[PDB]
Design a binder for this molecule. Structure first.
Ligand SMILES: CN(C)CCn1c(=S)[nH]c2ccsc2c1=O
Lengths: 237, 300
């Protein structure tokens, strides 16, 4: 059944599972036409497919050519997502295939279930959590590879950098959730927090800065400050 | 015009014959039903006065033999039996008619309701859904489960309706996942009509039989089957034009006959709103949409 606060610990057990977020697959800019009508122009997108235990991110880049000549693109996007997740699973050795796939939006359930009929032993689950994976395109290196792509492409990342050398996957996911929640509520402020000190750099093979343990506590506090504020600045409190 | 005699009526019971019904008192001098129209299947059904639990009954066709009803005090129900001695049977019936101890099948001459509800229903197909090969008639009751219900527990006492499942490999061609799930024409026309039922008359017969078991016995798996067979057509973009016109007539008469006070349990809001207002066939069921909107506007 659904994944929620009550069964949150299950994410970090030893059953392989993947989150799938489809919120950045079909992306458009809306603009005026010469005749004064409105039109959309698609831009490149991505499927965000994440193992929360290991940090392994399978970023399938969705090039705009996949939408050419197609109708009802928001519906097609869900089916394209399910086609690509199904292809990913079939590409993995049996012992690496997930036992569960958790979709962040319930509209992905039927598309994924139909594409995975061959895998009756993989559970497709929704979640009651409002996980902030849509903000993945605020991570500069991820946005960069998506926008530069000229063809369909799969790129593999560890979204935890090397954190698992020092913290648990439970703590790693909590840190990722705080960073993504910050970036989604106030991207400019969040990014100022992360880069302000020019002496802390991002390694070439990493996504986030090389904070010491103590600096991560400060950073996380600052992210905790931003989110509670914006929640005032929004509701006036 | 054929006759189904009763040996006796030892327990108070409401007896149904097709869409008609009448009350029989405990040990009343009742000896059966005469003037039953030849050419149609029929159903004779029962609800005891003490135990409204378990409506039950028998599907039969008088052309296939001489049938009678006899109460069994051990098993506690009215049983249908076949009489093989045709002279004993005619002699029994003639005596009961002379003494006027039979109710007359009370068909109004203008009235085509039963024909319209059973147009495509054949006794030979009933007997493949309800497997009990030693008898020419078929028993159904409120509790019997369907084969598909048993997959999600006695196989001998099941309703072997054709399994329909929209999220199944039979329903979904590899490489056509989105296409076949959003437009079920492949599954309707190739898998079910050409492959399993052979023609639309057999499909309609099973649909009509499922509705009638849902209505007369409150059989829940039958109701599920009826709605699944409607939804499979309504969710197909490509349906022969004669099938759509006939489906509209079938459903019209089913909705017309449904007891007004059972509509809450026997009609699935989601299927009907989808079929009448969202599906490919939203504009193809004019008669059905008009009677639904005038008789059950609350459901919609
Ligand atoms: C996504 N994880 C579950 C949130 C972790 N977590 C964090 S980072 N901060 C904080 C502050 C007060 S409570 C609390 C808390 O639980």
């Amino acid at each position: 059944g659904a994944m929620n606060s009550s069964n949150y610990a299950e994410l970090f057990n030893n059953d392989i599972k993947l989150f799938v977020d489809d919120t950045n697959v079909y992306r458009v800019t809306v603009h005026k036409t010469f005749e004064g009508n409105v039109a959309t122009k698609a831009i490149n997108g991505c499927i965000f497919t994440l193992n929360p235990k290991t940090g392994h991110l399978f970023l399938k880049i969705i090039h705009t050519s996949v939408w050419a000549g197609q109708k009802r693109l928001s519906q097609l996007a869900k089916w394209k997502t399910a086609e690509e997740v199904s292809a990913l699973v079939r590409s993995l050795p049996k012992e690496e295939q997930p036992k569960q796939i958790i979709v962040t939006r319930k509209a992905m359930l039927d598309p994924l279930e139909v594409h995975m009929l061959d895998f009756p032993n993989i559970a497709i689950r929704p979640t009651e959590l409002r996980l902030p994976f849509s903000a993945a395109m605020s991570i500069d290196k991820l946005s960069d590879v998506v926008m530069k792509a000229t063809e369909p492409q799969m790129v593999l990342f560890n979204i935890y950098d090397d954190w698992l050398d020092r913290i648990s996957s439970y703590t790693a996911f909590s840190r990722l959730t705080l960073l993504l929640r910050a970036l989604k509520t106030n991207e400019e402020s969040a990014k100022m927090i992360l880069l302000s000190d020019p002496t802390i750099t991002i390694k070439s093979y990493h996504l986030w800065p090389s904070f010491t343990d103590e600096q991560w506590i400060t950073i996380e506090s600052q992210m905790r400050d931003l989110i509670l504020t914006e929640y005032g600045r929004k509701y006036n409190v | 015009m054929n006759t189904v005699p009763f040996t006796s009526a030892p327990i108070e019971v409401t007896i149904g014959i097709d869409q008609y019904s009448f009350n029989v008192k405990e040990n009343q001098p009742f000896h059966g039903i005469k003037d039953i129209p030849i050419g149609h299947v029929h159903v004779i059904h029962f609800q005891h006065a003490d135990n409204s639990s378990m409506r039950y009954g028998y599907w039969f066709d008088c052309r296939m033999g001489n049938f009678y009803i006899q109460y069994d005090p051990k098993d506690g129900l009215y049983k249908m039996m076949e009489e093989r001695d045709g002279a004993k049977f005619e002699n029994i019936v003639h005596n009961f008619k002379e003494r006027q101890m039979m109710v007359s099948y009370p068909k109004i001459d203008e009235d085509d309701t039963w024909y319209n509800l059973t147009e495509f229903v054949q006794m030979d197909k009933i007997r493949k859904i309800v497997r009990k090969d030693e008898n020419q008639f078929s028993y159904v009751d409120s509790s019997m489960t369907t084969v598909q219900e048993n997959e999600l527990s006695d196989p001998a006492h099941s309703l072997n309706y054709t399994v329909i499942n929209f999220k199944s490999r039979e329903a979904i061609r590899p490489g056509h996942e989105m296409e076949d799930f959003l437009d079920k024409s492949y599954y309707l026309n190739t898998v079910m009509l050409q492959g399993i039922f052979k023609n639309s008359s057999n499909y309609f017969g099973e649909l009509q039989f499922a509705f009638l078991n849902a209505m007369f016995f409150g059989n829940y798996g039958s109701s599920l089957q009826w709605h699944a067979m409607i939804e499979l057509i309504c969710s197909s973009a490509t349906v022969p034009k004669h099938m759509l016109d006939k489906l509209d007539e079938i459903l019209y008469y089913q909705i017309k006959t449904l007891p007004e006070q059972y509509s809450d349990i026997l009609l699935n809001e989601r299927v009907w709103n989808i079929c009448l207002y969202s599906s490919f066939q939203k504009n193809s069921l004019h008669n059905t949409e008009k009677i639904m909107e005038n008789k059950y506007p609350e459901l919609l």
